[PDB]
């Protein structure tokens, strides 16, 4: 035939979860598109990679129309 | 069986040359901390006679430690090393000819 083909797995998805302590810069979640939006103290890079901008705890916030956001609540 | 980890690469320049090695003066780092141990008049003669020279072409006192008062004949002094001995001793430089 002519089929046996596939690009190796990219291992994306939720990397960090809500209620997890995070350093500054830890990739919070790798993703295909905008399956998750940025938020409080959370930036993103060319591949739509979400990552902490501060130290603290992750939190997820669903907002229907707006979409799903993820932020880190600072504290020390 | 595959490419050995020899995939890494030789940055090392000067790695060789036909006639071989170039005869150049070798400076032995000798700290003035061990230098302060004994006291009198430290010269290359003493440090090799018993210490940390070992026929090494040159002597160069330097670094951490506290300088005892005495004449220290060496072939080179660290900038920071010249301070410690200057603050209580003489700075006898090397030869020349």
């Amino acid at each position: 035939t002519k089929n046996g083909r596939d690009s190796q797995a990219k291992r994306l998805g939720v990397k960090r979860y809500e209620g997890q302590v995070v350093r500054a810069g830890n990739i919070l979640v790798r993703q295909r598109g905008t399956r998750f939006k940025p938020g409080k103290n959370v930036g993103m890079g060319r591949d739509f990679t979400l990552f902490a901008l501060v130290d603290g705890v992750v939190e997820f916030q669903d907002r229907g129309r707006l979409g799903r956001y993820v932020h880190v609540r600072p504290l020390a | 069986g595959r490419s050995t980890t020899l995939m890494r690469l030789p940055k090392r320049g000067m790695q060789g040359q036909v006639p071989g090695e170039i005869k150049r003066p070798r400076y032995q780092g000798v700290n003035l901390k061990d230098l302060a141990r004994f006291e009198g008049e430290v010269t290359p003669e003493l440090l090799v006679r018993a210490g940390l020279l070992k026929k090494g072409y040159r002597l160069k006192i330097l670094g951490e430690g506290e300088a005892k008062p005495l004449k220290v004949v060496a072939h080179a002094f660290s900038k920071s090393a010249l301070e410690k001995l200057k603050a209580a001793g003489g700075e006898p430089v090397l030869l020349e000819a």
Partner: protein, 63 residues
């Protein structure tokens, strides 16, 4: 008798004062054509190895 130092590996790998083994970053001489300034810069520095670090130690032994 008397192990010989592996010259090929001395010519490309310096062992640190502690016990670590360092070498230059791979893939910076040929593939190049136009890679992010990040790449060519990331490739300038040297690194540490892991397990084979111990493998390569067992050559430059007299060294």
């Amino acid at each position: 008798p008397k192990m010989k130092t592996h010259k090929g590996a001395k010519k490309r790998v310096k062992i640190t004062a502690s016990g670590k083994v360092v070498a230059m970053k791979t893939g910076k001489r040929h593939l190049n054509w136009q890679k992010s300034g990040k790449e060519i810069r990331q490739k300038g520095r040297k690194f540490v190895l892991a397990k084979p670090e111990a493998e390569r130690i067992k050559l430059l032994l007299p060294y």
